[PDB]
UniProtKB/Swiss-Prot annotation, chains A, B:
Activity regulation behaviour: Completely inhibited by the serine protease inhibitor diisopropyl fluorophosphate (DFP) and potently inhibited by 0.5 mM ZnCl(2), 10 mM o-phenanthlorine, phenylmethanesulfonyl fluoride (PMSF) and N-tosyl-L-phenyl-alanyl chloromethyl ketone (TPCK), but not by N-tosyl-L-lysyl chloromethyl ketone (TLCK). Activity is not affected significantly by protease inhibitors, such as chymostatin, leupeptin, N-ethylmaleimide (NEM), iodoacetate (IAA), L-trans-epoxysuccinyl-leucylamido(4-guanido)butane (E64) and pepstatin A or by CoCl(2), CaCl(2) and EDTA.
Protein name: Dipeptidyl aminopeptidase BII
Effect of residue 171 to A: Decreased enzymatic activity to 23 percent relative to wild-type
Effect caused by changing residue 498 to A: Decreased enzymatic activity to 32 percent relative to wild-type
Outcome after substituting residue 550 to N: Decreased enzymatic activity to 21 percent relative to wild-type
Temperature dependence: Optimum temperature is approximately 30 degrees Celsius for the hydrolysis of Gly-Phe-pNA. Stable at a temperature below 20 degrees Celsius for 30 minutes.
Any one GO BP annotation for this protein: proteolysis involved in protein catabolic process
Disulphide linkage map: 46-63, 142-150
Protein purpose: Exopeptidase that catalyzes the removal of dipeptide units (NH2-P2-P1-) from the free amino termini of oligopeptides and small proteins. Peptide digestion is sequential and substrate recognition is non-specific, with the exception that Pro is not suitable as a P1 residue. Removes many residues of bioactive oligopeptides such as angiotensin I and neuromedin N and also cleaves oxidized insulin B chain. Able to hydrolyze an X-Pro bond, an imido bond. No endopeptidase activity. May play a physiological role in feeding.
Record annotation: effect of changing residue 192 to A: Loss of enzymatic activity
Database matches in Pfam families: Peptidase_S46
Quaternary structure (record): Homodimer.
Gene giving rise to this polypeptide: dapb2
Length: 698, 698
């Protein structure tokens, strides 16, 4: 069912958990450093988990793809063939940017965070700056212990703040990956789709120094020895059984105001989808012509194409369940309940009204803001503005620097700067500059930016050509020029005759004013949002509903049951797929080209002792009514006894709307069954040492 | 499961019947004039049944479609609106061609038939003619009492012969029909499809004279009083429950030789498909700017579509299931077994070789025979050749006239020649003549017909155009002129300058020679087929299996259980559809335009006391693993106690291939649930007096 619950609130939902079938105590699972929640780890974008007392980590295949590719040659293709390390000495480095983060300590810092905000009085900009400062000092002081990375998370609009201190493991090595036609069986064709037959798993091992402390790759490091780790289920998972997922969903916006949601559906999503489709067509058209373009812009185009299809998909989904109407009616109920109460209801009504006013304010300049932002996100303008901005911040002391530009941020910046070379071709970037300039000159007089207008020196076709021609002369194309600016001082930037840097210098005072305006609105939001969300929570309580905060990168549990769904009368998706289902999709061409040893074993009905007779086969994937979103790939699925029954890896297309809604009839997570991991590792691409390490071998 | 069981054999499958859930005794349901089976009646191409002691009869809506349309006018459009007769005086005549045939008596005549055949000796043609003589006398004797029509059926290639004497009711009236968007919801879109949501039912009432004998329509007639009629189930039908169907399946070819099957799949089906699509195209093109054509050729075009699509989808089914390989392999086993028998097995092996030889004889002229038969079946040539043939037969004693051309056949002939008016337009029929002649002159020289060659005077497009010009002068376009020829002497035909007549007179000697060749072949088949089929039966029995004869238009029982099917891993069709499914398909446009009272009742959940809580609604249609074919439309579906739970009206698209094989996994009948009939009659298009008559009033 719906909900991304923080572990601390699980005792409060004891009743719902027990009814769904949970057999462990909610008090046990509420401990974020305990058994099993302390086994759950973050990879930076994916979830994973510990599965042995010697640092073995399981996650999805696409979560490990980076590492698999990295250790692949032109002439030895782990992507195709799989990877296996028969001893730990055979495990290969995932490279110096790979991480496993493990929770060390959590602290509720709400009282301190609220005091700092409260000290700013009625000054909205001051409130923002005060929270910024609180956070930066907190993180600094927490991270003064080497080995650790800290994060401050705000819950429910700032009703609650929590500080997480994570051990930062920096020597992560690949231990196993199934072949690519298992890991990614069905490729993009089966993306978002059920029925699903994908063995989406892989294994790392975490390493530390012999002193126990994190260290970069070294042959003297040894496996990390986790305090907690997960065990394979010994009861066979069946339709209707309790399941829960623990993982790190990135962000949701489940409590958006009716007007905010309407603006997203009516303007934001259609407008962004449009520009994205125009960009896609431009890149498609040029990559045919050219070919450097084709290879370097392929991932950028895929990103646009992805967002574009998901926005279109959500808009249809909304109309399908009347999400806007449902939201409007619940909001009306809330406002009615508050209005009924006297004076006592007024602060929350006032807060609702302030939230509406801020949405009008950001709506008044929505076209300008989007155009300027995406114009400045083109490659040469992006790097110019980012570099110049850094040089301004450098000229203050670190403690005053804008997050993103502190000393902790510099590796990330240099990272991006080097990466840019993989996705930049000047002929193509000129076309993207042109597109965004033509969007710019379509803005009304009252949405223009004087500094840009003055730079452009006119606003017809010929103005834009002159401007493209000037910018052509920049030298920030090359990595090596860019690295010189990364270290250059503000007055160098101001002396430069580089036409991209001169753009940056011309517009920066304006960009800073716009930034200050966002921060001002954001400080008003600090005041009004928690108040409104508390009133929402109180209303829901009166109605007997428990409330969960929006996702915010922290560890959450979602629970429910293994179950199919039926989009149409007279048919149902069954909760499981099976081995025979995989073979029935064989074409053998990419992406339906299973390994031969899989075809042979299924034909032989070598079930490896893993069959579930209720389904007549070994299970492959299954559906459940769990509530996940981006961040949850790789999350472990646990059973009623907190034992591992699979990994989360996708959802059905009805899950594409997970930022905004959950449809209990149709939304389903797709998981790969723990028995299918075992079956692949027994019958297809053998990992006897891992099976034994996990006590299911052996 | 598989099998179209003759009732007389039901005692010998007591075990399977009971295992499947039958609660009546096998003996009781074997009784063809008893309860319930004596309630089942034939309409001539559809099955129906009695459902009251005052002669009320239920069947499908497309079975009653002729009657509905006949009583329809633009001002009162019964097809669209439905029909109800609240009193028996309101019921309207289904027309002079409508029939209800009620079984009076069956006799096994196998001994006298086999004797008549034996007395003709070794001459194949004489054997056919002996069987013809036997059959004609038998029927003449049986029909001597007014009011009855009789038929002789041969089972299992002539192993058994039975004579059925039926009361021929000729006054049939429409009592109820649901609106068209209920009777045919989904139209041709949902045809052969599941999920299905179609209320495919209608009611008639059978009338006889006040003396109790059959009579043509008269207002002095009164309702027939049946000895046995079905009652509605009092038990709610659920998933897994026993169901059976009784009706008159037309033809199957489940025991064909591998080479007979191959000929059909490789030649017959693809050839016919192709011709029919050519014809369908010409008729659809011509109809777009001539609506006389389009109105009059619509039944005809839809006949072609049905066969075309069925053959295209049998052919797919054959490949899905490797039907070719199955047959060859199964025939391999039988032949091996037979060789394993003594001398004992030699007759069946000789029979097998004979049948192969007959097949090669038929194949040597297959193109000639099909082209000439389809040419001659165009409207004017069909009419001329038939009317000339009749004049030839009228010159013999009735006893010696060909079946189809006896006294007893005359109304049916006169029927046909009147009804041709409804489906003929000269300029369309010319295009059809032209297609077929163009096929004719494309024939290989050794597949030509000397008489057609002489009449053409050449073998080219020029000769074709001359023939069409010649034929266009016929007078047989008018009903009046056809009825003259109906009555004419053969001398008159042979003196006629009517060019269609001239054609018939020129070709008839040929047609009678080809008829004689067919009959000679059938005379050989008469000897070989039953020996081979008896061998297949013995073989099947040596392997522990029960055997049933191919369909031959006689009454059969098929039994099984309510069940869905799963065509892909990860999904299932559920056994029932529901009211909410009807409404989810609504578009407001034909064919997905339910009556508003339907939409209103489902929205208010007026389930009228008919809901089955196991499916959360009133059921609509359901699937089961019964074995039906063409002729079974309208068959009553009965439960374990012999009570009415549905009507058969279609099958899923996977069957179709059924003619050649029954696929236990995928073959399903689609029925309309008796609750849905009740529901429509209560809540949508009300007939409280009929439900009262059926003891299901509220
Ligand atoms: Zn512990
Ligand atoms: Zn972290
Ligand atoms: Zn805490
Ligand atoms: Zn109900």
């Amino acid at each position: 069912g719906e909900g991304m619950w923080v572990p601390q609130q699980l005792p409060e939902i004891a009743g719902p958990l027990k009814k769904a079938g949970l057999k462990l105590s909610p008090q046990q699972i509420s401990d974020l450093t305990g058994d099993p929640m302390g086994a759950v780890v973050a990879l930076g974008g994916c979830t994973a988990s510990f599965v042995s007392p010697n640092g073995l980590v399981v996650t999805n295949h696409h979560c490990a793809y980076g590492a698999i590719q990295l250790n692949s040659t032109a002439e030895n293709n782990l992507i195709k063939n799989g990877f296996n390390a028969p001893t730990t000495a055979d495990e290969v480095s995932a490279g110096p940017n790979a991480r496993v983060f493990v929770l060390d300590e959590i602290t509720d810092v709400t009282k301190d965070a609220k005091a700092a905000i409260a000290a700013a009085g009625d000054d909205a900009l001051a409130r923002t700056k005060a929270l910024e400062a609180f956070e930066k000092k907190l993180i600094a002081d927490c991270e003064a212990e080497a080995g650790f990375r800290c994060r401050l998370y705000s819950f429910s609009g700032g009703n609650t703040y929590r500080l997480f201190k994570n051990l930062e493991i920096k020597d992560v090595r690949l231990a196993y990956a199934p072949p690519g036609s298992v890991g990614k069986f069905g490729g993009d064709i089966d993306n978002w789709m059920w029925p699903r037959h994908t063995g989406d798993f892989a294994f790392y091992r975490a390493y530390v120094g012999k002193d126990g402390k994190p260290a970069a790759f070294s042959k003297d490091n040894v496996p990390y020895q986790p305090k907690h780790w997960l065990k394979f289920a010994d009861q066979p998972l069946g339709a209707g059984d309790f399941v829960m997922v623990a993982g790190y969903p990135g962000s949701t916006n489940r409590y958006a105001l009716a007007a905010e949601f309407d603006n997203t559906a009516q303007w934001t999503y259609p407008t962004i989808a449009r520009h994205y489709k125009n960009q896609i067509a431009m890149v498609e058209a040029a990559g045919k012509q050219n070919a450097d373009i084709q290879v370097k812009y392929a991932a950028t185009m895929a990103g646009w194409n992805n967002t574009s299809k998901n926005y279109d998909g959500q808009l249809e989904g909304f109309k399908r369940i009347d999400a806007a109407g449902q939201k409007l009616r619940e909001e009306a109920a809330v406002l009615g309940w508050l209005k009924g109460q006297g004076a006592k209801g007024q602060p929350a009504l006032d807060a609702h009204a302030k939230l509406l006013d801020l949405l009008e304010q950001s709506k008044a300049t929505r076209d300008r803001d989007l155009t300027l932002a995406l114009f400045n996100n083109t490659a040469m303008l992006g790097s110019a503005t980012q570099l110049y901005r850094l040089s301004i911040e450098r000229e203050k002391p670190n403690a005053e620097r804008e997050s993103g530009y502190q000393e902790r941020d510099l590796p990330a910046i240099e990272g991006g700067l080097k990466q840019l070379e993989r996705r930049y071709v000047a002929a193509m970037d000129r076309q993207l500059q042109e597109y965004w300039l033509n969007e710019y000159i379509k803005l009304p007089a009252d949405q223009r930016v004087a500094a840009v207008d003055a730079w452009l020196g006119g606003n017809d076709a010929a103005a834009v050509k002159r401007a493209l021609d000037r910018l052509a002369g920049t030298k920030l194309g090359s990595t090596e020029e860019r690295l010189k600016w990364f270290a250059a001082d503000r007055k160098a930037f101001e002396a430069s005759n580089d036409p991209a840097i001169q753009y940056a210098v011309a517009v920066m005072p304006t960009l800073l004013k716009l930034e200050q305006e966002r921060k001002t609105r954001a400080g008003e939001n600090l005041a009004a949002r928690p108040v409104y969300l508390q009133a929402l929570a109180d209303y829901k309580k009166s109605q007997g509903e428990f409330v969960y905060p929006d996702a915010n990168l922290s560890l959450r549990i979602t629970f429910g049951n293994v179950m199919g769904y039926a989009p149409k009368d007279g048919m149902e998706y069954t909760p499981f797929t099976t081995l025979e289902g995989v073979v029935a999709k064989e074409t053998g061409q990419d992406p339906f080209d299973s390994p031969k040893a899989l075809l042979d074993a299924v034909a032989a009905k070598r079930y490896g002792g893993l069959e579930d007779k209720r389904i007549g086969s070994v299970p492959v994937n299954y559906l459940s009514d769990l509530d996940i979103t981006g961040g949850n790939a790789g999350s472990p699925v646990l059973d009623a006894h907190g034992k591992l029954v699979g990994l989360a890896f996708d959802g059905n297309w009805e899950s594409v709307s997970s930022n905004w809604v959950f449809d209990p009839k149709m939304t389903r997570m797709i998981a790969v069954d723990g028995r299918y991991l075992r079956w692949i590792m027994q019958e297809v691409y053998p990992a006897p040492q891992l099976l034994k390490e996990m006590n299911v071998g052996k």
